[PDB]
Amino acid sequence: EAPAAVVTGAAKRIGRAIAVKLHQTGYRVVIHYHNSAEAAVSLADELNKERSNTAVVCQADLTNSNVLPASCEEIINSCFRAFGRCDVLVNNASAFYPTPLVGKTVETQVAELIGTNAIAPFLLTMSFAQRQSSNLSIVNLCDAMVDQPCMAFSLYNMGKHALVGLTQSAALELAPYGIRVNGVAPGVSLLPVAMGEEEKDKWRRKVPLGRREASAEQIADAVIFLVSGSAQYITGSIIKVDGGLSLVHA
Amino acid sequence: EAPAAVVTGAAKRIGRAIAVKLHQTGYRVVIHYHNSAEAAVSLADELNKERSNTAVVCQADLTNSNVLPASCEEIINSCFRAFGRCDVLVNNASAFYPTPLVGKTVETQVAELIGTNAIAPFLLTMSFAQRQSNLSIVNLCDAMVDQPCMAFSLYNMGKHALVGLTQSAALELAPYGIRVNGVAPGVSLLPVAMGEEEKDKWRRKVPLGRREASAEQIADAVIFLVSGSAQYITGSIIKVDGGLSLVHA
Amino acid sequence: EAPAAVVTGAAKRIGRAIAVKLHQTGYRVVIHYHNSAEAAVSLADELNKERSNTAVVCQADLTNSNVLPASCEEIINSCFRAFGRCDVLVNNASAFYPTPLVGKTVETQVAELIGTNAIAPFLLTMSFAQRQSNLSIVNLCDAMVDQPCMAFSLYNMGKHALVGLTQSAALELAPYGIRVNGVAPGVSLLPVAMGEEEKDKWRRKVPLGRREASAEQIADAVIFLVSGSAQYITGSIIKVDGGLSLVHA
Amino acid sequence: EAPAAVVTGAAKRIGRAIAVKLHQTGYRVVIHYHNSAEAAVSLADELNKERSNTAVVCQADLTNSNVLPASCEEIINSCFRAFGRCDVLVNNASAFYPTPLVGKTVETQVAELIGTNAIAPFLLTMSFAQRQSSNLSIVNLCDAMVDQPCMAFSLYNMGKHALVGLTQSAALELAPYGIRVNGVAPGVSLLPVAMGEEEKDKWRRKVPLGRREASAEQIADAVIFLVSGSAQYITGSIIKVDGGLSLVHA
Ligand SMILES: NC(=O)c1ccc[n+]([C@@H]2O[C@H](COP(=O)([O-])OP(=O)(O)OC[C@H]3O[C@@H](n4cnc5c(N)ncnc54)[C@H](OP(=O)(O)O)[C@@H]3O)[C@@H](O)[C@H]2O)c1
Ligand SMILES: NC(=O)c1ccc[n+]([C@@H]2O[C@H](COP(=O)([O-])OP(=O)(O)OC[C@H]3O[C@@H](n4cnc5c(N)ncnc54)[C@H](OP(=O)(O)O)[C@@H]3O)[C@@H](O)[C@H]2O)c1
Ligand SMILES: NC(=O)c1ccc[n+]([C@@H]2O[C@H](COP(=O)([O-])OP(=O)(O)OC[C@H]3O[C@@H](n4cnc5c(N)ncnc54)[C@H](OP(=O)(O)O)[C@@H]3O)[C@@H](O)[C@H]2O)c1
Numbered sequence: 002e003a004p005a006a007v008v009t010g011a012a013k014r015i016g017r018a019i020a021v022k023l024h025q026t027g028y029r030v031v032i033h034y035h036n037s038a039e040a041a042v043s044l045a046d047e048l049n050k051e052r053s054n055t056a057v058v059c060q061a062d063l064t065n066s067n068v069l070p071a072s073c074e075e076i077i078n079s080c081f082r083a084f085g086r087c088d089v090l091v092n093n094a095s096a097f098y099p100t101p102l103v104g105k106t107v108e109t110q111v112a113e114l115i116g117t118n119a120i121a122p123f124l125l126t127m128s129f130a131q132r133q134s135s136n137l138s139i140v141n142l143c144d145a146m147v148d149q150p151c152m153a154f155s156l157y158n159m160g161k162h163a164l165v166g167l168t169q170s171a172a173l174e175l176a177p178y179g180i181r182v183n184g185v186a187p188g189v190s191l192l193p194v195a196m197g198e199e200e201k202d203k204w205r206r207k208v209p210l211g212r213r214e215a216s217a218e219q220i221a222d223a224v225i226f227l228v229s230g231s232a233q234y235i236t237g238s239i240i241k242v243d244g245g246l247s248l249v250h251a
Numbered sequence: 252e253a254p255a256a257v258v259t260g261a262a263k264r265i266g267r268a269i270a271v272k273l274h275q276t277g278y279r280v281v282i283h284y285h286n287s288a289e290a291a292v293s294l295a296d297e298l299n300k301e302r303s304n305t306a307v308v309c310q311a312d313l314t315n316s317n318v319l320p321a322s323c324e325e326i327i328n329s330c331f332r333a334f335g336r337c338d339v340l341v342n343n344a345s346a347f348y349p350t351p352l353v354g355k356t357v358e359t360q361v362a363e364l365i366g367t368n369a370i371a372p373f374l375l376t377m378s379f380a381q382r383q384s385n386l387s388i389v390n391l392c393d394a395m396v397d398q399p400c401m402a403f404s405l406y407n408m409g410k411h412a413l414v415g416l417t418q419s420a421a422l423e424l425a426p427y428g429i430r431v432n433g434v435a436p437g438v439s440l441l442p443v444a445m446g447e448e449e450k451d452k453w454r455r456k457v458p459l460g461r462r463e464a465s466a467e468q469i470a471d472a473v474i475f476l477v478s479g480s481a482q483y484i485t486g487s488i489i490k491v492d493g494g495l496s497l498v499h500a
Numbered sequence: 501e502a503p504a505a506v507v508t509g510a511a512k513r514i515g516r517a518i519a520v521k522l523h524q525t526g527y528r529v530v531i532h533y534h535n536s537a538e539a540a541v542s543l544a545d546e547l548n549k550e551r552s553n554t555a556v557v558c559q560a561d562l563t564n565s566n567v568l569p570a571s572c573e574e575i576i577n578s579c580f581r582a583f584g585r586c587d588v589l590v591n592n593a594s595a596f597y598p599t600p601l602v603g604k605t606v607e608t609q610v611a612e613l614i615g616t617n618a619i620a621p622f623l624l625t626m627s628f629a630q631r632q633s634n635l636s637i638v639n640l641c642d643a644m645v646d647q648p649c650m651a652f653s654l655y656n657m658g659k660h661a662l663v664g665l666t667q668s669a670a671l672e673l674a675p676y677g678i679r680v681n682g683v684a685p686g687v688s689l690l691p692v693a694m695g696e697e698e699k700d701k702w703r704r705k706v707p708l709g710r711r712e713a714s715a716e717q718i719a720d721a722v723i724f725l726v727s728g729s730a731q732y733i734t735g736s737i738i739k740v741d742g743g744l745s746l747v748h749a
Numbered sequence: 750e751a752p753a754a755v756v757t758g759a760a761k762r763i764g765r766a767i768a769v770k771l772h773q774t775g776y777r778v779v780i781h782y783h784n785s786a787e788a789a790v791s792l793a794d795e796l797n798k799e800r801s802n803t804a805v806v807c808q809a810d811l812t813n814s815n816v817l818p819a820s821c822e823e824i825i826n827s828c829f830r831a832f833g834r835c836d837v838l839v840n841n842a843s844a845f846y847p848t849p850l851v852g853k854t855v856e857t858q859v860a861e862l863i864g865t866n867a868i869a870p871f872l873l874t875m876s877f878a879q880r881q882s883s884n885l886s887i888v889n890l891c892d893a894m895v896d897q898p899c900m901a902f903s904l905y906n907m908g909k910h911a912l913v914g915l916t917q918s919a920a921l922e923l924a925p926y927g928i929r930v931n932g933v934a935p936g937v938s939l940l941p942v943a944m945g946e947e948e949k950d951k952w953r954r955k956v957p958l959g960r961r962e963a964s965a966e967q968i969a970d971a972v973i974f975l976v977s978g979s980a981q982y983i984t985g986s987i988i989k990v991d992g993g994l995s996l997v998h999a
């Protein structure tokens with residue numbers, strides 16, 4: 002029987018590439034999404050056309066709230082309902098916007114940025130572990146630039162740092178259960194689709210390896226390594242996939 | 252005019268030592284507390300007996316909620332109300348208890364551990380900056396963040412977020428002359444509930460003296476960071492751990 | 501045409517595992533060795549029996565000296581002489597023994613430990629780059645460098661310098677399409693001189709399975725980094741330690 | 750009795766500021782130098798004018814060689830010969846120049862950069878420890894930008910990384926002897942006198958805190974803290990003094 006994976010925020014970009022590569026590797030996938038219903042459903046449809054009943058969709062807001070634990074439990078439950086198992090969890094879903102220190106209220110900013118990047122990964126990790134030849138692991142999507150953060154992105158940065166702490170803490174604690182916990186950390190490496198080419202060029206020019214952004218597929222490559230049998234001794238590790246960007250001084 | 256400092260969770264232990272050393276250095280202090288009302292007022296009394304009108308208390312729950320921003324705004328406001336200025340913020344208050352992955356609901360555990368260790372520090376930093384000499388913030392971090400205690404994920408996540416805040420705020424507040432730094436104890440004043448046998452186990456692990464840090468030793472690093480001897484230092488976290496984080500399993 | 505790889509200290513243990521896995525992936529290999537001539541030739545024989553003319557041996561002392569640069573240039577040269585190209589360099593060869601601060605002279609200890617772990621990797625990196633597809637260098641680092649073994653200062657300094665080389669060379673060789681990465685074991689194949697009781701002590705420290713890594717497991721991470729699956733990865737060091745570095749004292 | 754300190758490369762700049770501040774604090778000082786004989790003697794004169802018999806000079810090349818262990822032993826011995834004790838060692842002396850991967854031979858480059866920045870610190874640490882209410886410590890001058898290195902400075906960077914490892918290893922090992930081992934890490938924060946003012950300004954403009962370099966005094970301030978009784982529980986710590994420079998992404 003085929004293993005199953007949950008990928009949060011899997012409708013687009015890096016999450017989509019991860020879900021696709023897991024599927025191509027033989028995984029059945031839960032495609033979690035928030036707002037991108039059309040994209041998520043069309044992805045699941047494409048994957049199911051490839052192999053019957055190997056993809057399902059699951060909608061959840063991962064903003065922090067008192068119902069977030071239940072939402073995360075339900076995401077994991079959806080994998081068990083659909084496929085009878087859950088082997089891999091990929092914490093990809095993420096809010097990303099500036100929150101300067103000096104329309105959204107600050108409590109909403111906190112809830113979205115810390116919720117998506119840190120608390121939901123924690124609760125999903127809890128639910129994943131509680132519900133557990135096999136090769137069980139979690140991959141957290143981190144950020145290679147966390148020590149050299151984007152100006153005015155404190156809450157985002159705090160969230161990604163907490164995600165590092167979660168990766169380490171969970172690796173330590175879940176090791177007895179055979180659950181490995183690792184991370185993949187892109188740099189400022191695949192720029193937002195809205196951004197102008199000229200603004201994208203400012204970042205690209207800074208990347209030592211090829212003066213270009215990573216493809217979503219290149220990020221997904223590191224995720225599939227970490228979930229694979231080639232990484233069976235690897236836990237608590239975060240792989241930078243940044244083309245040398247974090248090595249470049251101001 | 253004397254400068255003024257806010258120290259969160261200042262009624263006992265390390266927070267108390269920080270507040271005392273700041274006061275001894277000439278600062279007027281806001282002693283924030285949560286449940287330790289008697290201890291907090293006792294300390295304020297002692298400091299005011301030393302120099303009149305140089306200490307006030309301020310009660311606030313630092314658990315995450317939709318009113319945490321208001322509570323943090325009020326803590327900073329209380330410093331301006333009492334002393335007309337706020338020069339130093341010390342983010343000391345912290346919940347610390349295990350939250351295994353496998354009586355408190357998980358929602359509550361998240362709110363207390365992430366709230367106290369990370370979100371409140373953020374909101375206090377915001378309010379501090381907004382309300383603005385030698386201005387700085389010191390965050391009480393943790394030297395063992397990369398070698399965490401078993402089953403302390405939420406606490407560890409909070410302290411990691413605190414590192415990210417220290418860096419992010421240092422970067423962003425530098426143009427305003429506000430320095431943001433951290434002090435990271437390994438083992439200092441051990442928990443009150445911890446038995447002497449378990450305390451001795453931890454003490455035995457420390458290379459420098461086989462003993463825990465005094466609260467005063469931790470405070471010493473805090474007062475260096477706030478002092479004029481640290482005027483070019485921002486985004487730095489000073490370990491004060493007697494070599495504990497250097498010891499392999 | 502098949503790509504070619506240089507693996508230093510490849511006659512046994514992790515170096516052999518790396519050479520073997522590269523060969524199985526389709527690489528022609530230079531098996532560098534120092535004292536293990538019989539093991540190195542035996543390995544080359546086995547690989548050549550599998551595919552004709554795909555393995556050669558190369559002997560060199562990688563102790564620091566004024567001729568180390570020439571020795572390292574010759575190792576790289578031997579790859580070009582044998583295979584007409586050099587696509588991958590694996591810096592595996594390493595001296596490892598205690599050097600307490602309080603038979604070998606200290607100058608010899610410095611020369612061997614810093615030479616093998618740091619200076620030779622640097623000189624090999626220089627010669628590799630100057631002689632220049634999917635080109636990359638993999639440095640064998642150490643996951644425990646921030647939690648070092650007691651009285652292993654020179655070894656530890658060498659491994660830290662190897663981190664700096666990994667970073668510096670990644671930055672500088674990126675314009676040439678040469679990626680530079682590392683693999684950091686915690687405990688893998690334990691020293692042959694180590695008694696089984698001491699080996700079991702180390703094994704028990706490992707959260708993931710209470711066991712050391714096989715050489716193959718280390719080699720797996722090396723082959724990932726050299727592969728097309730790692731084409732955007734440079735300046736990264738992958739821990740392969742089963743969580744060892746996460747465990748506090 | 751006054752405590753005594755060895756400061757390597759103390760004739761100029763940061764080393765000089767350190768020597769001066771230690772002296773002002775009540776230390777007797779050994780002023781080590783390499784080529785700056787006039788500056789070293791002039792400093793010794795100035796300090797002895799202040800308090801008689803509190804400063805001596807010691808010349809040594811700290812380039813790696815088979816005679817380096819003896820040279821380092823003699824530097825420490827000079828403190829004991831002059832002052833009868835040695836309480837503090839400051840590893841400040843440092844070669845700093847580019848060594849591209851693609852007049853000096855590479856073996857000389859290796860000897861100078863790795864010798865001054867790492868091997869000599871190690872040998873001096875050995876001799877210091879062997880020769881031992883007291884407050885013994887070593888302060889190593891590190892570099893805040895070691896993870897974001899200057900282009901083509903690989904040997905320098907390797908040296909500074911090795912200095913980090915020495916700081917940690919020696920802290921662990923010398924703790925039982927009451928010898929603390931710490932570091933102070935400036936950024937690109939006090940620029941080379943040979944650098945043109947226009948290039949200096951490019952670097953100054955990068956520093957978030959004040960858009961300016963650190964004074965040598967400010968670096969010395971951190972050294973003074975670490976040697977003081979206010980740092981009695983601090984060992985294996987490296988204090989960045991970089992005005993936020995290392996926090997700034999490319
Ligand atoms: N792109 C980069 O260069 C880069 C750099 C560093 C780190 N990373 C990390 O890598 C991961 C993937 O990056 P990306 O750029 O592909 O991400 P992205 O497109 O910006 O967002 C990924 C998904 O997160 C989901 N999301 C946002 N808010 C949510 C919420 N409140 N509840 C549930 N889901 C929510 C969104 O789902 P819907 O579309 O369905 O609404 C979105 O599609 C992220 O964790 C990111 O932080 C990326
Ligand atoms: N002690 C150590 O060995 C050690 C080690 C590493 C890091 N640290 C860090 O150093 C700092 C001080 O340590 P410590 O041992 O002195 O701390 P602590 O005694 O455990 O706690 C300090 C104060 O935090 C306040 N606090 C707890 N929950 C709160 C809440 N929900 N809202 C508002 N305040 C709350 C408490 O105030 P009330 O009593 O008034 O209720 C308490 O007095 C902490 O940030 C800690 O994480 C300490
Ligand atoms: N084993 C572990 O648990 C572990 C843990 C952390 C890191 N690592 C790293 O992973 C790598 C492989 O480990 P390992 O245990 O397989 O290594 P190893 O057996 O201790 O040494 C590998 C080879 O290094 C060569 N070597 C030693 N001194 C040399 C010199 N002066 N000149 C030239 N070659 C010299 C030897 O070649 P000859 O036999 O031909 O003389 C030896 O076979 C090393 O870099 C190591 O530091 C290993």
Ligand SMILES: NC(=O)c1ccc[n+]([C@@H]2O[C@H](COP(=O)([O-])OP(=O)(O)OC[C@H]3O[C@@H](n4cnc5c(N)ncnc54)[C@H](OP(=O)(O)O)[C@@H]3O)[C@@H](O)[C@H]2O)c1
Binds near residue numbers: 758781786809840
């Ligand atoms: N300047 C900065 O912004 C900065 C940044 C990061 C780190 N640091 C670190 O801070 C420390 C002081 O910096 P700095 O700029 O003041 O240093 P510096 O002026 O470049 O050099 C300090 C001294 O090192 C000595 N030296 C050089 N080569 C030597 C050799 N082969 N043998 C013995 N001594 C030798 C020289 O002594 P003589 O003059 O007597 O010949 C020189 O005066 C250094 O360790 C440096 O790496 C500085």
Ligand SMILES: N#Cc1c(Br)[nH]c2nc(N)[nH]c(=O)c12
Binds near residue numbers: 096146188189190
């Ligand atoms: N560029 C960029 C992004 C970074 Br840095 N972190 C991110 N996180 C999310 N979720 N999306 C993004 O586009 C990015």
Ligand SMILES: N#Cc1c(Br)[nH]c2nc(N)[nH]c(=O)c12
Binds near residue numbers: 344442
């Ligand atoms: N021992 C201990 C403590 C650590 Br580690 N982190 C802590 N945080 C708080 N707040 N209190 C404590 O006693 C401790």
Ligand SMILES: N#Cc1c(Br)[nH]c2nc(N)[nH]c(=O)c12
Binds near residue numbers: 595642687688690
């Ligand atoms: N055990 C072990 C070893 C470590 Br840790 N680093 C090493 N380096 C080499 N070269 N050999 C070894 O056996 C080990």
Ligand SMILES: N#Cc1c(Br)[nH]c2nc(N)[nH]c(=O)c12
Binds near residue numbers: 843845892894
């Ligand atoms: N700017 C600058 C310098 C750095 Br970064 N590291 C250095 N090291 C030495 N020795 N001298 C210098 O001027 C500098």
